Amino acid sequence: KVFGRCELAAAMKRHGLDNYRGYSLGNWVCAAKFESNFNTQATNRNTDGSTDYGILQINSRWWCNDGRTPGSRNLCNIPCSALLSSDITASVNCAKKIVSDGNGMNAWVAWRNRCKGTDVQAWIRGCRL
Ligand SMILES: [Cl-]
Ligand SMILES: [Co+2]
């Protein structure tokens, strides 16, 4: 599924991401835009052989099991395919674990490089939330 901006914002809010660990909703929308262009089916292979999955590009070395990443820790206890669903629950639940791991949203390089320190409120402007 390719979400609209406000549609994604509303779904993220319903799943409790607004101000989760102090990160306002716009941060999450911005991260999703630059990680996946709001496409739940996005996959991208990394140089280390791991793969990133879904709307928030969650990686198979640490977080989910894709059956081809040796030494995967699978800390979210899910198959990576679950992160490609039109229903964002699994992605959100795993993202909550990732953001709690010590480095906050710096875990997403696209967030650090393209969202951090910008006017992230713009990402939810206009939306009925
Ligand atoms: Cl933080
Ligand atoms: Co990545």
From Swiss-Prot:
Report disulfide bridges, numbered on this chain.
6-127, 30-115, 64-80, 76-94
InterPro entries for the chain: Glyco_hydro_22, Glyco_hydro_22_CS, Glyco_hydro_22_lys, Lysozyme-like_dom_sf
Stretches assigned to the C-type lysozyme domain:
1-129
Q: Which GO terms describe its cellular component?
A: cytoplasm; endoplasmic reticulum; extracellular space
Q: Which UniProt keywords apply?
A: Allergen, Antimicrobial, Bacteriolytic enzyme, Disulfide bond, Glycosidase, Hydrolase, Secreted, Signal
Q: Where are the transmembrane segments?
A: none
- Reaction(s) this enzyme catalyzes, per UniProt: Hydrolysis of (1->4)-beta-linkages between N-acetylmuramic acid and N-acetyl-D-glucosamine residues in a peptidoglycan and between N-acetyl-D-glucosamine residues in chitodextrins
- Superkingdom assignment: Eukaryota
The record's annotation in Gene3D superfamilies points to: 1.10.530.10
Protein location: Secreted
| Active site as annotated | 35, 52
Enzyme Commission number(s) of this protein: 3.2.1.17
Matching PROSITE patterns, A to Z? GLYCOSYL_HYDROL_F22_1 (PS00128), GLYCOSYL_HYDROL_F22_2 (PS51348)
Family indicated by similarity: Belongs to the glycosyl hydrolase 22 family.
Partners and quaternary state? Monomer.
Q: Please state what the protein is called.
A: Lysozyme C
What species was this sequence derived from? Gallus gallus (Chicken)
